[PDB]
Design a protein around this nucleic acid. Structure first.
Length: 1108
RNA sequence: GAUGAGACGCGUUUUAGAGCUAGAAAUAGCAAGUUAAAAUAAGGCUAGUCCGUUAUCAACUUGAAAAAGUGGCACCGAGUCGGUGCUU
DNA sequence: TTGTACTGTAGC
DNA sequence: TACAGTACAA
């Protein structure tokens, strides 16, 4: 009657088992539908559900964000063309059309093949006069004569399309662009972060060293030689190496137990820093971001090398000089190679495949690969000294479009565009009428707090309009309601407190959150108040020596004090307090308790917004308290991220008996100390009661709102479905208790507790019909290790179901609390039939791989556009199949035409999924199938199970790919032998337990020679990999004499042959066995298709040999 | 630890940037190369400077969908479950 | 002309 | 890890 269900949730597996009060798994004759001969199969109430991991939305957001950027960039180009078209029509009728159809082959091109002028003579004249776009840009800046309108459009479109970054706010000035200024800023925060043993850099010249044209290591060494107190391996040298773009090791300087490294690579814009500051703390992030902006200063000064003259547009002239040096150095390299090393001349300049100059230009070889290829060549070749330093300084034969251009601010392109429009203002009146329009097209950026400019049809937009019309950059300021949109951004961006999920979290930099983390570290209150007022409110970093010298000896008059709470220095700090004291300089204003809301609203404003306008509006309310220079400075300050506690928790809720908040208890608790975890946990405090009341609020309400990765949510939803089907199996009877694995544990317990215990009374608040019991994995693992019921991951996926049954057994034994019970548990662990089910899931994602392949005559290339034939324009490859579809039809075959019936699978890809589901019959008719029988169309997702002769099971991975779907049910004594054979000298138990394991593995060593026969039999029956079987048998026979460790580890990798899933390449001692791929789905046309439920206890078997 | 907004720079793809000479040639020698346009998931309609890779998904019967419903028990054994006995 | 075998490919 | 490209058996 009464029964228990034990569960085991993982990221990719949910194992389940049903036990009785005698710790036995029941077995029932489950009915099976379908046209097969079998009507009922005996199945056991134990199994596991296997599924592909749940994915974070992050990659989908990266794609979504880029998808908007390309759209808005095309819209910018369209705005510029909209401005230009009316005047351009009387100059060239089909210029924009030619620029649109420039991608097309000449046969598909309606107009002339030359995009700019449409005549070959003028195009050749253009390319001779301006070999790059920057020559045209520099001329248009530096010429007063009337220029052609189309070249002006080309220059402005090149600057509007590729407009550079917005990281620097305001106009360009040396205070944030000249390398010396931000170098002094870097050493300023370097001194502020420690203030013990600082570095002082006053007489040094940064622009002489960092902007010098020299190799990077030599520049670093010279800068280190300018500072005798620091070295290259020092933390300052580490920071300067980051500024130079090297790969320094911060873990060495901060004594981390694991390697931590950073570099500002071409598409990792300091985002790797999370793994470092998760360990070393967030105090150093201001050091690293200043290093990043100093790096941007160094690159900007490097590529603006012509800024030594004010005579022209700096970036265009600098690219011109780079082109000139590239040409003059290239002809020298060609002569130097041809004169003295005629061999490999063709390899460098003609081959275009071996990373030469031809591979640098016409091939996919980067700058550093090209340098690495030719560096041995230049070491061998003579006369290369003046040219090799260009490799050592990364200046040799550089292109104009490179990864370093990400450091270019938008102000440079803005200045060049302004210079062009001011130079051509009188010649074209519509430039005078639309100078501000084009400058606004270049300089407009959608704010943080606005989001997508939608009209209700977006999941993501909170943007609120004040009018119903099209939004352009010119009329943006009078259409969006900024107050409503910014307010709506706050309502979304506030996180909620994990203790009280109704309540808004504080800013991380919030002053009360600083006081919290300080006082929580000291309690691990007159003395507390004196220490905080004397040191913490005076200095950023306080050590134990400062406490014993400046407080205990000075105030308490204690000569010798021993402190054990804190080792060296306090991790917490009042940094926001000292920051405010630096900016406002009216210290007593923060002493007034009334102003706390004003201060925390200010730091809330800076933690919300990044743009100047809304920040200016929100703090402008406080202008009657203070004014002028303090706003003028604090408008540049910003903060990032959020605390754990709500403002509603920390000082908001008051204990119902003591009349004190959490921070009130932290400040004073009488003659003894108490910490935050205890303040929540102590039953003497009503915080325990109030949190356990207020923490609780459909299944999706709990799953969507709770904190966790989509990977662990998937196991929770599947574990609820498994519970529902197991209740359905047992006559709708509920379990006596449900056992769960292991802070997510209390949310999983709430979901199952609330789905089972739906009844309540007037006096009983909750009737515990079912007791959801939570256990820790340490207990089950210790039970497994102590009593010889060992497990491995490599033999089979039966360990999930065995883990679930052990969870059930230990949980029931614990709530109720060595003979027949041990025999029962050993019989169940050696019990062969376990309902392993791989979840059949329609594949979703990108419908193909992202790499665009060149043109070819194959029909397998996917068209990148509707009118772009992939035989001519290239296209994508490797499409992803959402699901396969079993079709029977007639196919037109042969020159002498007849209609032959065929049955075959066809893969419906993701892009053809919707077109298939609108009309399957016409979609199949378009593929050549005619007389298609509609009712026999069977949808076959990924992991569809088929059964063939001798119990051979195959899982469908695609339309033309199968997978191994059988489990090797090796007996429990052999898995015990295998586990004890491995880990031979690392049990870390008693020596006697060690030796009773060793004689067990030794004197049954013929078990190994029997398990290899087990592998051979199982593989010959269901795997059909005979060549690999002979290979592994020969390798096992000729490595028989190698001892227990290596042999019984390589035989653990040997089960990769018999493991269900894709065939993977395992390895023996030395030999590596290539996988045997099942690239033929012809055999499952006459197999038995298996429709397994979530538990797999209910099946619907269709015999496909009776169809067609 | 979840989620979201705004931006940059590469990369790839086709085309434009007239290749020259010896050549019956399959080709050989030389010259040249750095840039730009267009696309960046096919596309969708409420046509927005929006949306399109996350989450959900065994089979059957109802239901536009949502959603609901659909499958006997005990014992003896074990090569992916078998056999025996009651029951409608 | 249709199936198999082996090796290579895949955005940041 | 499923698909692509080249290379053979009929």
């Amino acid at each position: 009657k009464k029964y228990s269900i034990g569960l085991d949730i993982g990221t990719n597996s949910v194992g389940w088992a049903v036990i009785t009060d005698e710790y036995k798994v029941p077995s029932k004759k489950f009915k099976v539908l379908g046209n097969t001969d079998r009507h009922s199969i005996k199945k056991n109430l134990i199994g596991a559900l296997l599924f592909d991991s749940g994915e974070t939305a992050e990659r989908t957001r990266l794609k979504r964000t880029a998808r908007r950027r390309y759209t808005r960039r095309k819209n910018r180009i369209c705005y510029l063309q909209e401005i230009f078209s009316n005047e351009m029509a009387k100059v060239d009728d089909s210029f924009f059309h030619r620029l649109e159809e420039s991608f097309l082959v000449e046969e598909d091109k309606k107009h002339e093949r030359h995009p700019i002028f449409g005549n070959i003579v003028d195009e050749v004249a253009y390319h001779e006069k301006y070999p790059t776009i920057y020559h045209l840009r520099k001329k248009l800046v530096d010429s007063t004569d009337k220029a052609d309108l189309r070249l002006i459009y080309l220059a402005l479109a090149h600057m509007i399309k590729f407009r550079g970054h917005f990281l620097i706010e305001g106009d360009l000035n040396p205070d944030n662009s000249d390398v010396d200024k931000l170098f002094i800023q870097l050493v300023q925060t370097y001194n502020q972060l420690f203030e013990e043993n600082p570095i002082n850099a006053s007489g040094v010249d940064a622009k002489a060293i960092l902007s010098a044209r020299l190799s990077k290591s030599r520049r670093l060494e010279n800068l280190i030689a300018q500072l005798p107190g620091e070295k290259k391996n020092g933390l300052f040298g580490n920071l300067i190496a980051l500024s130079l773009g090297l790969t320094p090791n911060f873990k060495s300087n901060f004594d981390l137990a694991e390697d931590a490294k950073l570099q500002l690579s071409k598409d990792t814009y300091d985002d790797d820093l999370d793994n470092l500051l998760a360990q070393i703390g967030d105090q150093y992030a201001d050091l690293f971001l200043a290093a990043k902006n100093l790096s941007d200063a160094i690159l900007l000064s490097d590529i603006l090398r012509v800024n030594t003259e004010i005579t022209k547009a700096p970036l265009s002239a600098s690219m011109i000089k780079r082109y000139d040096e590239h040409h003059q150095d290239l002809t020298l390299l060609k002569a130097l190679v041809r004169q003295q090393l005629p061999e490999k001349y063709k390899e460098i300049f003609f081959d275009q495949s071996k990373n030469g100059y031809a591979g640098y230009i016409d091939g996919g070889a980067s700058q550093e690969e090209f340098y690495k290829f030719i560096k041995p060549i230049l070491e061998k070749m003579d006369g290369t000294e003046e040219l090799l330093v260009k490799l050592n300084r990364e200046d040799l034969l550089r292109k104009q479009r490179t990864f370093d251009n990400g450091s270019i601010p938008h102000q440079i392109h803005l200045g060049e565009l302004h210079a062009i429009l001011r130079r051509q203002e009188d010649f074209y009146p519509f430039l005078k009428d639309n100078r501000e329009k084009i400058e606004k097209i270049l300089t407009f950026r959608i704010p943080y707090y606005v989001g997508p400019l939608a009209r209700g049809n977006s999941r993501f937009a909170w943007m609120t309009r004040k009018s119903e019309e099209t939004i352009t950059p010119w009329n943006f300021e009078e259409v969006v309601d900024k107050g409503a949109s910014a307010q709506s951004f706050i309502e979304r961006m506030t996180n909620f407190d994990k203790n009280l999920p109704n309540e808004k979290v504080l800013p991380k930099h919030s002053l009360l959150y600083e006081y919290f983390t300080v006082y929580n570290e000291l309690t691990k209150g007159e003395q507390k108040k004196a220490i905080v007022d004397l040191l913490f409110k005076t200095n950023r970093k306080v050590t134990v020596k400062q406490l014993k010298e400046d407080y205990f000896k000075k105030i308490e008059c204690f000569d010798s004090v021993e402190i054990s709470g804190v080792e060296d220095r306090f991790n917490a700090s009042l940094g926001t307090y000292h920051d405010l004291l630096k900016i406002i300089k009216d210290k007593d204003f923060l002493d007034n308790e009334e102003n706390e809301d004003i201060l925390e609203d200010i730091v809330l404003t800076l933690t919300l917004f990044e743009d100047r306008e809304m920040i200016e509006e929100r703090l402008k309310t406080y202008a009657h308290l203070f004014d002028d220079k303090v706003m003028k400075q604090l408008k540049r300050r910003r903060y990032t991220g959020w605390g754990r506690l709500s403002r509603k928790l920390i000082n908001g809720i008051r204990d119902k008996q003591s009349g004190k908040t959490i921070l009130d208890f932290l400040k004073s608790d009488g003659f003894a100390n108490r910490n935050f975890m205890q303040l929540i946990h102590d039953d003497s405090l009503t915080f325990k009661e109030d949190i356990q009341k207020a923490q609780v609020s459909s299944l999706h309400e709990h799953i969507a709102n709770l904190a966790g990765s989509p990977a662990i949510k998937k196991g929770i939803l599947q574990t609820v479905k498994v519970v529902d089907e197991l209740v359905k199996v047992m006559g709708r009877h509920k379990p006596e208790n449900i056992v769960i694995e292991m802070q997510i544990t209390k949310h999983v317990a709430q979901i199952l507790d609330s789905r089972m215990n739906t009844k309540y009374d007037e006096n009983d608040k909750l009737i515990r019909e079912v007791k959801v019991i939570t256990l820790k994995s340490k207990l089950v693992s210790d039970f497994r290790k102590d009593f010889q019921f060992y497990k491995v991951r490599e033999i089979n996926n039966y360990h999930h179901a065995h883990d679930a049954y052990l969870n059930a057994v230990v949980g029931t034994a614990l709530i109720k609390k060595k003979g027949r019970d041990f025999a029962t548990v050993r019989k169940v662990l050696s019990m062969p039939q376990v309902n392993i089910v791989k979840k059949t899931e329609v594949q979703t994602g990108g419908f193909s791989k992202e790499s665009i392949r060149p043109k070819r005559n194959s029909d397998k290339l996917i068209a990148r556009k509707k009118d772009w034939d992939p035989k001519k324009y290239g296209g994508f490859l490797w499409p992803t199949v959402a699901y396969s579809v079993l079709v029977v039809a007639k196919v037109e075959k042969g020159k002498s035409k007849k209609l032959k019936s065929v049955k075959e699978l066809l893969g419906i890809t993701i892009m053809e999924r919707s077109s298939f589901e609108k009309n399957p019959i016409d979609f199949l008719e378009a593929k050549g199938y005619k007389e298609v029988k509609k009712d026999l169309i069977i949808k076959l997702p990924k992991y569809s199970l088929f059964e063939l002769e001798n119990g051979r099971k195959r899982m469908l991975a695609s339309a033309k790919q199968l997978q191994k779907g059988n489990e090797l049910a090796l007996p429990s004594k052999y898995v015990n032998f295998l586990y004890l054979a491995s880990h031979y000298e690392k049990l870390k138990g008693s020596p006697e337990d060690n030796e009773q394991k060793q004689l067990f593995v030794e004197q049954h060593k013929h078990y190994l020679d029997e398990i290899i026969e087990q592998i051979s039999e199982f593989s010959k029956r269901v795997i059909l990999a005979d060549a690999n079987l002979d290979k592994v048998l020969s390798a096992y026979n000729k490595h028989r004499d190698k001892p227990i460790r290596e042999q019984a580890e390589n035989i653990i990798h040997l089960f990769t042959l018999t493991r269900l899933g894709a065939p993977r390449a395992f390895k023996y001692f030395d030999t590596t066995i290539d996988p045997k791929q099942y690239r033929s789905t012809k055999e499952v046309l006459d197999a038995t298709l298996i429709h397994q439920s979530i538990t797999g206890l209910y099946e619907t078997r269709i015999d496909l040999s009776q169809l067609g």
